[PDB]
Design a protein around this nucleic acid. Structure first.
Ligand code: ZN
Length: 672
RNA sequence: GGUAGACGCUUCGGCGUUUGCC
């Protein structure tokens, strides 16, 4: 049965108004979506019918809502379907939309069909439901859909527009400093969704509270480790590696605009990257010492990265975790004359590092305050379900081994949850491997605590956790309100454990931003709905004028060279390059086939017309630098290269340029 | 292969991390 606060949220939508529904995570917005959609489809007379589209930002939420809407409306005589990236190609989308009454969609599927013209205008729909509507922002596919909606509303083109409904737990305030700034960000968000009403729970607040409780937050400010015998060693290997680069490249300190860099910092990381992109554009006339000097500096900068990474891992986890990170790196580097030198310089101090990592007196004080908290809660409630958010995927693996390798935590049964990772790198965690652990992360399951990276807005619902711990982890006001839904029962707790005062302070800001987020909405609801619809109209118009008044570059028909970024080897020319569907780039000619090898692809996914088959690398002198992928297009199998892997050398001028995207590289682009 | 968001850094063009979508 529907609750009274669920009916209260659906009331403005059931009255036909474009409504943003702001409610706490876990209060059952999905039921509210059904209540609105069940009312929308029954109000039409016999000679008419309605069509609803539901937008989902992730495949798990896509399959979830597709199954919920299917089993709720099938008996009532409505057809539900869905179009995701898997079933989007070679299918008549226009027929699928017309032959079904409810279509759960991924927003990119609609954005691509509006451009292709297969879906001419949004008039085909009578109701659009945006899940996590706060994402209707700068360039998200939600806003691109609303740009199509607004251009038809403001232009002279008539045609019935669909009702727009948005669900979120927080509309946000942006970078607002006071209530007036917060009120304008909310109004501009309502203008992006054409919303006339913000539906919140006001009359049944007592019922909503007895269903979703607010976890009490605890800020735990700690101190960093005092003496770092691990850093004194690793900082020496970096100074050693910094010197070996100097012998090859004089005045290396002038290669970056970053001064006074320090080991184990984000500023050093920006520095070790700036120099890396500068050593690739070196032009030696020998063209063989070029492949020697550049490749040598690329290895030094690559090794200096893992050292700087380990120094950060040491500051947030055990010295042993930063040790095993480097051990895996050199074990990956092995199986070159320069790599063997940097390995011997490391293997020398390896035994000394292990005698420092094993020293029980060099314990991380932050992990001892995390151990104290875990010991306390599981001593009070031994059936505690805990989820621990960390910043990097290396920190997930670090705290997992730390929990499994601590006798004081033998009561813990830790699990892992990371993102899917990059599509062309054997990293991350596949979707079945994700769902296989979230089914094991229960009070009756195998695992007692989950260590996770950041998660999408609300995502699939996992077991309620009476303990949530944020380890050096801070976010915006929206994410703060969504992590409350991790535990909704009475007695849920949330710990923010960090050694940085700016992290504690950012959460205090977010708490004040939420106050401004509510008080702005509270007084926004006290306006005449006609005045509100008119205020957003000039916003809708002024945001369109700016968009309508915002650059087609002139290409460079001069042929260029494409060299490997690591060994400077000639791979192909721009004359051999053909473009596919204005997005993807391949190489012709039989000379390019002699320059790359192929490993089987770790994630053989599929996009517009491509079947991933292999990854391609450089082959000259065993460079193995990633160049792209080898896919199977409609007819044949071809390589697909990324310009990020290469350096563009000009033939006559001899200049070497670095391009990060193909759109920023202008040359003769022949269709394939 | 192409891309979207969030967070941090920025010497304001980007860099890194992280999570996604086609
Ligand atoms: Zn190479």
């Amino acid at each position: 049965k529907p609750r009274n606060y669920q009916l209260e949220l659906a009331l403005p939508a059931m009255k036909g108004k474009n409504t943003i529904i702001c409610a706490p995570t876990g209060c059952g917005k999905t039921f509210v979506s059904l209540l609105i959609c069940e009312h929308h489809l029954k109000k039409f007379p016999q000679g008419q019918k309605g069509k609803v589209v539901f937008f989902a930002n992730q495949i798990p939420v896509y399959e979830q809502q597709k199954s919920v809407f299917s089993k709720y409306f099938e008996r009532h005589g409505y057809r539900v379907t869905g179009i995701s990236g898997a079933t989007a190609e070679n299918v008549p989308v226009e027929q699928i939309v017309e032959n079904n009454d409810i279509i759960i969609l991924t927003p990119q599927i609609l954005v691509n069909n509006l451009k292709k013209g297969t879906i001419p205008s949004l008039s085909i729909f009578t109701l659009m439901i945006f899940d996590e509507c706060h994402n209707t922002s700068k360039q998200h596919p939600y806003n691109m859909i609303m740009f199509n909606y607004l251009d038809q509303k403001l232009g002279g083109s008539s045609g019935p527009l669909p009702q727009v409904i948005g669900l979120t737990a927080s509309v946000g305030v942006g970078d607002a400093k006071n209530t007036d700034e917060a009120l304008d960000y909310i109004c501009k968000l309502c203008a992006s969704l054409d919303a006339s009403v913000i539906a919140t729970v006001k009359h049944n607040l007592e019922e909503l509270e007895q269903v979703v409780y607010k976890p009490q937050k605890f800020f735990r400010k700690v101190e960093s480790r005092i003496s770092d015998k691990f850093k004194y060693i690793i900082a020496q290997l970096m100074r050693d590696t910094e010197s070996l680069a100097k012998r090859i490249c004089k005045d290396l300190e002038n290669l970056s605009q970053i001064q006074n860099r320090e080991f184990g910092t984000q500023k050093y990381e920006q520095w070790i990257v700036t120099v890396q992109k500068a050593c690739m554009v070196f032009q030696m006339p020998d063209k063989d010492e070029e492949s020697r000097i550049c490749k040598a500096l690329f290895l030094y900068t690559s090794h200096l990265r893992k050292y700087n990474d380990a120094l950060i891992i040491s500051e947030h986890a055990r010295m042993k975790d930063a040790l095993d990170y480097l051990k895996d790196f050199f074990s990956n580097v092995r199986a070159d004359e320069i790599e063997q030198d940097l390995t011997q310089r490391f293997e020398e101090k390896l035994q000394e590092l292990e005698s420092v990592s094993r020293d029980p007196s060099n314990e991380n004080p932050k992990l001892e305050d995390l151990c104290f908290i875990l010991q306390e809660e599981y001593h009070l409630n031994p059936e505690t379900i805990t989820i621990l958010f960390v910043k990097t995927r290396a920190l997930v693996d670090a705290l997992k081994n730390w929990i499994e390798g601590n006798p004081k935590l033998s009561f813990l049964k830790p699990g892992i949850l990371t993102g899917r990772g990059k599509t062309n790198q054997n990293t991350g965690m596949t979707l079945p491997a994700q769902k296989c652990i979230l089914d094991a992360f229960k009070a009756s399951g195998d695992h007692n605590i989950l260590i996770a990276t950041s998660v999408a807005d609300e995502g699939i619902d996992i077991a309620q956790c009476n303990l949530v711990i944020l380890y050096e982890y801070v976010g915006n006001v929206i994410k703060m309100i969504q992590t409350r839904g991790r535990g909704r029962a009475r007695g849920s707790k949330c710990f923010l454990l960090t050694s940085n005062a700016g992290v504690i302070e950012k959460e205090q800001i977010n708490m004040y931003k939420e106050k401004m987020m509510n008080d702005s909405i509270l007084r926004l609801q006290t306006w005449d709905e006609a005045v509100f619809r008119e205020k957003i109209l000039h916003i809708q118009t002024h945001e369109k004028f700016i968009r309508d008044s915002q650059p087609k570059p002139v290409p460079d028909k001069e042929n260029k060279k494409l060299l490997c970024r690591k060994c400077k080897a000639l791979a192909c020319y721009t004359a051999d390059v053909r473009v596919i569907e204005e997005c993807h780039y391949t190489v012709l000619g039989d000379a390019f086939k002699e320059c790359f090898v192929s490993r089987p692809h770790p994630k053989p996914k599929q996009f517009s017309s491509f079947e991933k088959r292999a990854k391609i690398f450089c082959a000259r002198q065993n460079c193995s630098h990633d160049w792209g992928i080898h896919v199977k297009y409609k007819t044949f199998e071809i390589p697909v290269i990324k310009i990020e892997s290469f350096v563009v050398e000009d033939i006559a001028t001899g200049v070497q340029t670095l391009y990060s995207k193909w759109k920023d590289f202008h040359f003769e682009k022949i269709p394939f």
